[PDB]
Design a protein around this ligand. Structure first.
Ligand SMILES: Cc1cc(CO)c2ccccc2n1
Length: 126
């Protein structure tokens, strides 16, 4: 169902969460070789999450589930904020700009934490 597909999507989100927090530790430790690898891993995860989310939204639309569509339209808009900040973080790492990397990192955390109440509301709406 769309609901199982959302639980599948949620798990990918939590995996990216887990990797993100291991990457932060590595960055703080200066282990750039680890950071580079975790940034690759997070890119692949977010790319997969984004695609699963699109499929869920399209299915909610085909189902006529107006409330779930409203919530998913907002949730995906927030996701794209995250993706933009993530991409800026990756560029800061490429550039050696640790000040920008720290900034982007904390912003990506706050953006993600905010969007959590909506993430749970979608689960209940589908
Ligand atoms: C993989 C992933 C998961 C979540 C939520 O857990 C996100 C939230 C905002 C932006 C990007 C995100 N990327």
């Amino acid at each position: 169902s769309v609901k199982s597909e959302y639980a599948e999507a949620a798990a990918v989100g939590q995996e990216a969460v887990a990797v993100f927090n291991t990457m932060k530790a590595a960055f703080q430790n200066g282990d750039k070789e680890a950071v580079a690898q975790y940034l690759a891993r997070l890119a692949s995860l977010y790319t997969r999450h984004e695609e699963l989310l699109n499929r869920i939204l399209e299915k909610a639309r085909r189902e006529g589930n107006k409330e779930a569509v409203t919530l998913m339209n907002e949730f995906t808009a927030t996701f794209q904020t995250g993706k933009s900040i993530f991409n800026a973080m990756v560029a800061a790492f490429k550039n050696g700009d640790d000040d920008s990397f720290e900034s982007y990192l904390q912003a990506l955390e706050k953006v993600t934490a905010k969007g959590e109440t909506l993430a749970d509301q979608i689960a209940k709406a589908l």
